[PDB]
């Protein structure tokens, strides 16, 4: 009685997924009622919904008198159940694609939408519903309730197409979006590195001016500071933040650096005239101005990049877990379908089924561990 294992496993995993998803959704609602709703939250919630659907349609029915058997109902119920399973699979595949596309948009081309839906998620759900229509034609109450397809290779065109549209194409698109996103993030990183280096050289040269005792060294340090300031001022913000012409920058960043360079020029004039002490006093005033103006902007810029990187890493983790969990299932199904050597079977499909459900029950934990507010809410 191997079912002792099989059914039992289904039970527990079902519980897991259900519980976890429920909890996460609850947290979201709280964060949507306390005034901290977020643009990404919608996506996450919808993904959770997809997971729930999978469970309610795939491991619960399969957690029946071994689903495919008698005592189900009329052909209509069987066809509807299979359609629900296929739409659940498509939604699980495509919600991650929608999340990755949203990340790409927010990282590359920053731009209505409701509080529980938006354009990309609705598009993914609609595509999932409309692409699973064939499941109604193929499946019926054939008699158990199985599906008979066209004898001329009904499999190499159905199962292969399912694998191509659910796993191959969405995963390839997600990989392309991920590599583009990481290129963009690495770009926004060397620019902040250049700004940090300019700040470091400015500080070091200011210290040198303080320690100096002759006009030559003071003037050389001032020249280094001036070049560094000019280079830094020409550092447009990355695409991950506000538009470059705006009050925060045009009024305080560029103007701050203009006043900086003016003070540097005045110190240089004093040094050229030959009054080193006046140059040192001007350098101290320069320190005061730079600390007042640019430190907060640099600190703020160092934080938004961190949040963007954290969310991108969360999305990458979700994608990696999803592929690791669903690849064996599609691989085995395609192997059986396309290959003529399909006959061999030791009934490993139960393990692939459980592994596929692992991703659905794991996604909420992935999200919780990557969001401080949500993790605190789960408390």
């Amino acid at each position, epitope marked *: 009685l191997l079912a002792r294992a099989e059914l039992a496993l289904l039970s527990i995993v079902f519980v897991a997924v259900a519980l976890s998803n429920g909890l996460v959704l609850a947290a979201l609602a709280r964060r949507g009622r306390r005034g901290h709703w977020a643009p990404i939250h919608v996506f996450i919630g919808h993904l959770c919904l997809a997971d729930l659907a999978v469970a309610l349609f795939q491991v619960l029915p399969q957690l029946a008198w071994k689903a495919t058997d008698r005592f189900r109902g009329p052909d209509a119920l069987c066809r509807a159940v299979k359609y629900l399973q296929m739409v659940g699979m498509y939604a699980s595949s495509y919600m991650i694609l929608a999340m990755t596309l949203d990340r790409h948009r927010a990282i590359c081309r920053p731009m209505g939408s409701g509080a529980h839906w938006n354009r990309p998620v609705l598009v993914a759900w609609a595509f999932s519903l409309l692409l699973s229509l064939p499941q109604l034609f193929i499946f019926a109450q054939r008699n158990d309730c199985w599906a008979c397809f066209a004898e001329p290779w009904g499999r190499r065109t159905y199962v292969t197409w399912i694998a191509l549209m659910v796993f191959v194409a969405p995963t390839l698109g997600i990989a392309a979006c991920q590599v583009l996103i990481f290129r963009e993030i690495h770009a926004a990183r060397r620019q902040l590195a250049d700004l940090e280096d300019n700040w470091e050289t400015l500080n070091d040269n200011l210290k040198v001016i303080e320690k100096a005792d002759n006009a030559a060294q003071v003037k050389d340090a001032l*020249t280094k500071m*001036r*070049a560094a300031a000019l280079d830094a001022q020409k550092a447009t913000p990355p695409k991950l933040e506000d538009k470059s012409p705006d009050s925060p920058e045009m009024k305080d960043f560029r103007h701050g650096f203009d006043i900086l360079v*003016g003070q540097i*020029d005045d110190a240089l004039k004093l040094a050229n005239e030959g009054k080193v002490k006046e140059a040192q006093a001007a350098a101290e005033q320069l320190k005061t101005t730079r600390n007042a103006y640019i430190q907060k902007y640099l600190e703020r810029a160092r934080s938004t990049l961190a949040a963007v990187a954290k969310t991108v890493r969360m999305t990458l983790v979700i994608v990696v877990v999803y592929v690791l969990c669903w690849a064996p299932f599609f691989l085995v199904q395609l192997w059986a379908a396309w290959d003529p050597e399909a006959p061999l079977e030791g009934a490993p499909f139960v393990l692939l089924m459980l592994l596929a459900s692992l991703n659905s029950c794991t996604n909420p934990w992935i999200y919780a561990s990557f969001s401080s507010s949500v993790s605190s809410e789960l408390r």
Partner: antibody
Amino acid sequence: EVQLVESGGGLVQPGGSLRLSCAASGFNVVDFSLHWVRQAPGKGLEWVAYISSSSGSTSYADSVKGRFTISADTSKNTAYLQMNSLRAEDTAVYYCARWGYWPGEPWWKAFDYWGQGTLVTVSS
Amino acid sequence: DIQMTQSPSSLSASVGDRVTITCRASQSVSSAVAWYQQKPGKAPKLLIYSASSLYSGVPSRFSGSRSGTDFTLTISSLQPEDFATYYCQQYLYYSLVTFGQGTKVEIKR
């Protein structure tokens, strides 16, 4: 509209004195710093001196420091360069260039309006 | 003192030939490099007023680019009037002006 004209060049002897002048038309000398750049016959350009009438700041090159003296007159709107203790290497064509002040674009447009240049020859 | 060196002492080219002139600075001047064109018996003429920004009245024929400390002036299509000497200036500060050696462009044969 904008024009710089130099005058005062000529032939002199080593150790003599000379007085180059540059007159600007179309703008105010106060709003721009005036630089003197010399080019030896057949050689590359070489910055010589500069003055800024707004603050009175002046600067000279090391090779000619302590000999030349650059001044300006806003009423007549003209810059002057008094050259003393000349030598053979001082022979060159002296152009006068205009360079805007720091804030904004006038600074990034470096020497955007030169003059025709005046020839100076040092020889016994 | 900041020293600017131009590798090409003299480039020979024919009409319609793209040409490039390179300059290197001792220190790092923050895109404070200008490119001038001088013809015999004439004062220089400001072609490029920054590392890359073109000046008014100059055809788009000329262009400039910067890479850290390398600076390059590129002419796409060479015209009969293009033939003339070219100078690279570093203007980080009023008292730190320093020109290059000069690159002479002349017809090919």
